[PDB]
Design a binder for this molecule. Structure first.
Ligand code: ADP
Ligand code: ADP
Ligand code: ADP
Ligand code: ADP
Lengths: 145, 336, 141, 96, 134, 48, 144, 232, 124
């Protein structure tokens, strides 16, 4: 905590909108502030009624140029704790796959103008399956003397 | 409730008690026919290996309160066979010309523990021309206890009994030949109940599930992973003339649907069967609590099948004639 | 389409044989080992190599049963490939459910049976069931 | 001592003690006196939170709405589930 | 030819050295023995007080003593509590005949009597030492 | 009125979970039936 | 600390003077409507939400967003969390109720799982109390 | 002596009296808690609540018949037993019709299954017509007074059931006709069946039937198929 | 609250009060709650197997027209709670070494010598 993380990607994204002129919109959200079923969605075992999730939807608004999201780069930072839970439902997206499929066989594809990230304090509760397909960027606190 | 039966059949249906009627004389038989009969019912559930283990306990218990009673200090050493060995700094230097490092400590634990094994160190240090081959490595002749010791010790104690002398060999062997313990133990047990005792008699599923088991207790058959007892029941069911109704206790529609067959079966008196009951770890628990309370008709013989698995709730096997099955040794048997 | 193609390593082949040779024996394939080797990918590569329609059934999750029972009808008919990724991760309850089903299809499939009696449906020869997982315990599967 | 507690806004009692020692019986008494109404929680092996919450309403209303003197005796063998304490907790603190 | 075959079959038939049978008989004799040491206890303490009386390559070695030495303090400070959730189970195995969980910091055969595990660790420690001064 | 027992297995547990308990209500430790009580309750029950 | 509206914590023993010390100082503030929330082991981020839909209000600014402001006009709401360090941690050391707060303090808003629309806090600050994590049932607070 | 057997008897009877008071005042006024349904109708909510109250009272009425004071309020006790019972029986078949309808509602495509799309209109007709006589007089005891509603709702149950059964028989055929179809849940299937023309509203479902085939190619006319495009 | 694992006790009661009619129910099948109300009022012995999972709905009875409930336990180590211990009268039946030895000595004398049994029987 307090190493320059939240600030780093904030300057990077803000600066890229000039070297590319394209808007680098991001979407932060604590993956622990809400129940897992709200971060990806679930199925109502009474009518197959699917209740959308936070990430599921936030990934949709991009594939559907409702406001013209394709006209720029995206970022979905999970500023929250990391565990081998809400991360497994992404494996088929963090690697070659690129499709956050859902129990209802929604199969949500991942464009190339969209990027997913994490801003965790630690990974002591993370398995070799969580990170694996992810970009590790150490942010020692010693940076910000 | 199971034991009490062997006890009962001992006083009544004893195959060797059908003759003589004198009670004073009959007692002689029962006093011994208890271990034999008991071991027979139990040995049907005990896996080959464990078969002998139990035999020993019954022995020490039989020769109890007799001139053959084993010293609680010796049986204490058999189990507590110098388990502390990994911390005996004392030594036996005047014998380095025979026993080795870790080999020496053992002789001490024996002398240190059991009393009837204190003069040992000396007997060996004396006529070493006897124990030479015993401790003697490359011995193209299964190690042998010097008859000098077996007797020199027998008299060195009022305990001049054969059975006692036999047991003792095990102790000596456990300390210098941990691979002869299984053998010498067999010899000891036999000298008490006869070499015929441990003779694994072939079963006879006839009298068993028909004239030796009430409809109250099933016949669970815990087999070994890689073998199925299924066929066993089928071959006997049809070749006996009776009802039947197997069931795959694993599928979804196998739980509820099946049970019915069991209820009615016990109501009229028909045979049933349930294989791989282990596949249903959470179900069997229910069967138990139920089966327990439901007096069936004499012509009932609910069967069960699975592999030795911890799943089977204790209350399950306990209320039934468990039969352990396992592929025997030898290459011949495998081929056939 | 363009899809993905693994690298025919000396293992990918020794594996390609065990499956084909075993798949020819009217029996499903089961590649065990420490997660992260090819268990799933290789299986998918084989099917894609034979112009088949392999399917990856993700377990260790909410694995729907009411859905699985159905999909099987498709595999048997279409003649597709059913690959269960981490098939050992299913809850004992569910794991016992599916297992019982695969037992039905695979058994009847070894007898040539033109139609299975799952859940009578048509059974296609090209259909195949694959179950991946971690190595058992001391050699046992 | 049980009386003192009753005659006082937000007066609750935490009687710790051996079983069948008079904890309930003696509490019912002092309650019956000051005009309080003892309300129990008839439970069983087949209860639930969807049940406690419901009854938590019959009570909460009888006090806040109908201004009545109730003496809710809550025995340990009643918390047949965690949630029960969470409710009893806030209820004790801010009667809500 | 098969029926005419002798029941018993030695380990030589399996291309194994005749001695092989000696190892099997030994373990089987031990397991049987161990069982009798249980069916005796169930049909019938201050241990810690005793065991307490004990206690380019440059890169590798450094860790060998670091990670290992760290275990020394653990065993000393953890056991010293002879006279929570962890401290509880840590004493179960000591009274059941198994090496307490959190202690196995190094590769050691599953079935290894308590008395031995500790002994090894002791000698295994003087190992790291002799390297220090060296 | 909370009526629990000192023996109850989950004793020191029903505490930490809910602070209001040992912080709001008045804790009157009934304790065990004192020797003086046992005597009086016995003489009073065997009077007739 | 109260002027800047920071989630200060009044750590101290039982009856030290925490709850009191605060309520008194809060008086030196004209527009400071306080609310008392009693946390525990079950106090999840959801419960904290229930209190909002009973003191605050979701309004859609002329801009197009949607702010969460205290019902009373021109008044700062003070959400006082009595036993804030008691919330139980999941199977991965995480007091969801704390992360939820941090998300509203640093970020300034929380996602409303129903229409997935960012809800920014207007005039709703925080202030909690508790005992040192040294005491039982207590759970150290995340450095985040 | 005798002065205590009457006093207690008088109090033991007023209890049965008091009991019936809450029952006679709870059902002769209790109105079905309806809720608007997407501006098409209004279903009945709070089932478990109605059932629990019906079961409770019915249990106390059946047991209070072994009381030395039951003989008095025996006529009113048995009356409620009848009324309350008919109420629980009607609700059971109703909660079935309520559901059986809701499902089939979001479906009836219709031009493909007339044999059943028509059989539903007859059910949907009287249903919305009867629900009006209910929404107006929510008195649970009044609605139970409609012209043989039991024989009417039981018919809607059967009918509505006979329809859904045919559906599964149709969907089952659509699949046996196109193997792949077994991969798409009943949900997406019904959608794929209705959009037989608007290929656009189907493009998104292909990935769950064919391996690489992700999107079909249409000619400049946008009516005929030309080729196929893979996700890549 | 008969703590009888050997089952001898249960077998004793079912044969002792077979006249007064007894129901071998338990806290299992729903038939329980229905059986109690029957035995309770209509008067007649009972028997609730597996008391490990007893419901706090019986309390009113375990503390008081003409019947008797028999709580049983097949678990010889069943660790109960204070409440249950107080409102119940424990009856241990676990067969110890000495006890069983006595059962055999009798069941053997009554058979391997019934004559010397008619003497003590009839006489005394
Ligand atoms: N180059 C810099 N020099 C001095 N201070 C900085 C610099 N960059 C960021 N900071 C300050 O240090 C803090 C770093 O926090 P940050 O790492 O961005 O958040 P988090 O800890 O949540 O990842 C910020 O609040 C910011 O005000
Ligand atoms: N022969 C190979 N050629 C190319 N890549 C391979 C090969 N074998 C394994 N891999 C890579 O290693 C990873 C193994 O993961 P996968 O096999 O999908 O999981 P699991 O090992 O659990 O079955 C794949 O993502 C793949 O890219
Ligand atoms: N001082 C007393 N004299 C006689 N009987 C008493 C006395 N105190 C309690 N009892 C008896 O002991 C029982 C205690 O029950 P109760 O108070 O409801 O449970 P608890 O004490 O466990 O809360 C009562 O039924 C009562 O008859
Ligand atoms: N300076 C003070 N002036 C008046 N009362 C005080 C003072 N300090 C402590 N107290 C008393 O001590 C009690 C402390 O309780 P409080 O602070 O509300 O709980 P906590 O300390 O657990 O937050 C108050 O009831 C108050 O009467």
């Amino acid at each position: 905590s307090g190493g320059g993380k939240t600030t780093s990607w904030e300057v990077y994204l803000e600066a890229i909108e000039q070297v590319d002129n394209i808007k680098s919109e991001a979407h932060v959200m604590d993956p622990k502030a809400i129940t897992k079923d709200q971060l990806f969605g679930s199925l109502d075992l009474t009518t197959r009624e699917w209740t959308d999730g936070l990430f599921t939807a936030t990934l949709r608004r991009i594939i559907d140029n409702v406001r013209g999201e394709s006209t720029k780069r995206h970022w979905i930072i999970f500023d929250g704790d990391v565990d081998p839970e809400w991360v497994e439902n992404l494996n088929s997206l963090l690697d070659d796959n690129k499709l956050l499929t859902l129990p209802n066989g929604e199969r949500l594809a991942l464009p190339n103008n969209v990027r997913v990230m994490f801003e965790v304090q630690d990974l002591k509760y993370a398995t070799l399956a969580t990170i694996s397909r992810c970009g590790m960027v150490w942010f020692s606190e010693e940076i910000l003397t | 409730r199971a034991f009490l039966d062997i006890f009962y059949n001992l006083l009544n249906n004893n195959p060797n008690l059908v003759d003589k009627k004198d009670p004073n004389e009959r007692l002689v038989y029962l006093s011994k026919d208890i271990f034999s009969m008991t071991f027979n019912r139990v040995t049907r559930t005990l896996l080959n290996d464990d078969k002998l283990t139990f035999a020993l306990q019954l022995t020490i218990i039989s020769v109890k309160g007799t001139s053959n009673e084993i010293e609680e200090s010796e049986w204490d050493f058999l189990l507590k066979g110098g388990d502390n060995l990994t911390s005996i700094k004392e030594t036996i230097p005047q014998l380095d010309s025979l026993l080795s490092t870790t080999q020496q400590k053992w002789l001490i634990c024996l002398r240190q523990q059991v009393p009837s094994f204190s003069k040992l160190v000396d007997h060996i240090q004396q006529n070493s021309s006897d124990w030479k081959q015993f401790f003697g490595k490359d011995q193209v002749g299964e190690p042998i206890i010097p008859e000098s010791w077996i007797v020199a010790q027998a008299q060195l104690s009022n305990q001049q009994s054969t059975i006692v002398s036999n047991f003792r060999k095990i102790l000596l062997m456990k300390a210098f030949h941990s691979d002869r313990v299984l053998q010498y133990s067999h010899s000891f047990v036999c000298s008490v109940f006869g070499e015929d005792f441990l003779n694994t008699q072939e079963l006879d599923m006839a009298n068993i599930v028909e004239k030796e088991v009430k409809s109250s207790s099933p016949l669970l058959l815990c087999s070994v992973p890689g073998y199925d007892a299924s066929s066993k029941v089928d071959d006997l069911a049809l070749q006996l003339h009776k009802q039947y109704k197997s069931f795959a206790i694993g599928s979804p529609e196998g739980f509820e649907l099946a049970e019915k067959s069991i209820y009615a079966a016990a109501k009229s008196g028909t045979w049933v069967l349930l294989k791989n009951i282990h596949l249903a770890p959470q179900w069997l628990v229910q069967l138990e609590k139920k089966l327990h309370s439901l007096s069936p008709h004499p012509s009932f013989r609910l069967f069960m099948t699975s592999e030795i698995h911890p799943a089977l709730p204790a209350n399950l096997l306990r209320m039934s004639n468990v039969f352990s099955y396992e592929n025997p040794p030898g290459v011949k048997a495998n081929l056939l | 389409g363009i899809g993905e193609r693994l690298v025919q390593t000396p293992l990918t082949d020794r594996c390609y044989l065990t499956l084909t040779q075993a798949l020819e024996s009217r029996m499903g394939g089961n590649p065990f080992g420490p997660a992260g080797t090819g268990k799933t990918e290789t299986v998918k590569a084989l099917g894609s190599q034979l112009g088949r329609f392999v399917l990856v059934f993700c377990c260790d999750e909410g694995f729907d049963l009411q859905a699985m029972s159905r999909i099987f009808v498709g595999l048997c008919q279409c003649g597709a490939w059913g690959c269960f990724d981490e098939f050992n991760r299913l809850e004992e309850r569910i794991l016992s459910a599916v297992s019982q089903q695969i037992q039905t299809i695979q058994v009847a499939l070894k007898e040539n049976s033109k139609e299975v009696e799952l859940l009578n449906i048509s059974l296609h020869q090209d259909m195949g069931i694959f179950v991946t997982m971690n190595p058992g315990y001391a050699g046992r599967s | 001592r049980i009386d003192r507690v009753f005659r006082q806004p937000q007066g609750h009692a935490l009687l710790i003690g051996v079983s069948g020692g008079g904890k309930s019986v003696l509490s019912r008494f002092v309650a019956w006196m000051n005009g309080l109404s003892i309300y129990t929680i008839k439970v069983n092996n087949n209860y639930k939170s969807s049940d406690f919450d419901d009854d938590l309403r019959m009570l909460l209303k009888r006090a806040g709405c109908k201004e009545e003197k109730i003496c809710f005796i809550f025995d340990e063998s009643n918390v047949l589930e965690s949630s029960f304490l969470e409710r009893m907790n806030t209820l004790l603190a801010g009667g809500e | 030819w098969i029926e005419a075959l002798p029941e018993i079959s030695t380990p030589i038939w399996l291309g194994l050295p005749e001695n092989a049978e000696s190892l099997l008989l030994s373990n089987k004799a031990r397991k049987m023995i161990n069982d009798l040491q249980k069916m005796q206890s169930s049909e019938e303490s201050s241990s810690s007080e005793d065991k307490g009386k004990a206690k380019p390559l440059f890169r590798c070695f450094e860790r060998e003593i670091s990670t290992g030495g760290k275990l020394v303090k653990k065993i000393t400070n953890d056991l010293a509590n002879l006279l929570t959730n962890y401290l509880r189970s840590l004493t179960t195995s000591i009274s059941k005949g198994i090496v307490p969980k959190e202690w196995k910091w190094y590769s050691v055969p599953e079935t290894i009597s308590l008395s031995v595990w500790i002994s090894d660790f002791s000698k295994r420690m003087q190992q790291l030492s002799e390297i220090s001064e060296s | 009125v909370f009526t629990m027992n000192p023996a109850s297995p989950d004793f020191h547990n029903r505490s930490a979970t809910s602070p209001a308990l040992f912080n709001r209500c008045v804790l009157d430790w009934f304790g065990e039936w004192s020797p003086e009580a046992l005597f009086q309750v016995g003489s009073e029950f065997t009077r007739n | 600390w109260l002027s800047e509206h920071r989630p200060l914590i009044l750590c101290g023993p039982p009856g030290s003077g925490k709850t009191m010390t605060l309520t008194s100082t809060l008086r030196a503030f004209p527009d400071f409507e306080v609310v008392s929330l009693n946390f525990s082991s079950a106090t999840t981020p959801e419960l904290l939400l229930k209190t909002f839909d009973h003191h605050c209000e979701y309004k859609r600014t002329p801009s197009g967003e949607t702010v969460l402001r205290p019902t009373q006009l021109g008044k700062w709401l003070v959400v006082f969390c009595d036993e804030i360090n008691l919330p139980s941690t999941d199977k991965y050391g995480t007091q969801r109720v704390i992360t939820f707060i941090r998300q509203m303090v640093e970020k300034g808003g929380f996602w409303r799982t129903s229409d997935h629309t960012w809800i920014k806090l207007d005039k709703i600050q925080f202030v909690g109390a508790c005992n040192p994590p040294t005491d039982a049932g207590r759970v150290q607070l995340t450095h985040r | 002596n005798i002065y205590r057997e009457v006093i207690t008897a008088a109090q033991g009877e007023i209890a049965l009296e008091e009991f019936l008071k809450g029952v006679r005042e709870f059902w002769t006024t209790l109105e079905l808690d309806l809720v608007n349904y997407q501006r098409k109708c209004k279903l009945v909510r709070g089932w478990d609540d109605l059932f629990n109250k019906l079961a409770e009272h019915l249990n106390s009425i059946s047991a209070m018949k072994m009381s030395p004071y039951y003989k008095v309020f025996e006529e009113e006790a048995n009356h409620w037993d009848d009324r309350l019972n008919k109420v629980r029986s009607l609700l059971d078949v109703w909660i079935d019709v309520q559901r059986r309808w809701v499902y089939l509602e979001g479906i009836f495509i219709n031009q493909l299954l007339p044999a059943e799309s028509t059989r539903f209109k007859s059910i949907n007709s009287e249903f919305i017509a009867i629900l009006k006589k209910v929404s107006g007089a929510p008195l649970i005891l009044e609605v139970l007074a409609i012209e043989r509603i039991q024989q009417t709702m039981e018919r809607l149950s059967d009918l509505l059931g006979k329809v859904q059964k045919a559906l599964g028989e149709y969907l089952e055929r659509q699949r046996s006709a196109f193997a792949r179809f077994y991969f798409v849940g009943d949900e997406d299937l019904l959608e794929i069946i209705g959009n037989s023309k608007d290929i656009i509203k189907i493009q998104k479902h292909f990935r769950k039937m064919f391996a690489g085939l992700a999107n079909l190619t249409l000619d400049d006319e946008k009516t005929t198929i030309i080729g196929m495009s893979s996700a890549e | 609250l008969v703590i009888d694992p050997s089952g001898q006790a249960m077998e004793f009661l079912m044969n002792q009060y077979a006249d007064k009619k007894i129901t071998k129910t338990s806290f299992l099948d729903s038939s329980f709650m229905k059986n109690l109300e029957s035995a309770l009022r209509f008067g007649c012995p009972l028997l609730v197997q597996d008391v490990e999972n007893i419901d706090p709905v019986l309390n009113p009875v375990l503390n008081k027209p003409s019947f008797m409930i028999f709580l049983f336990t097949r678990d010889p180590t069943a660790h109960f709670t204070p409440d249950l211990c107080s409102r119940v009268t424990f009856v241990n039946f676990t067969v110890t070494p000495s006890s069983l030895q006595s059962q055999c000595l009798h069941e053997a004398l009554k058979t391997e010598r019934p004559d010397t049994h008619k003497k003590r029987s009839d006489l005394l």
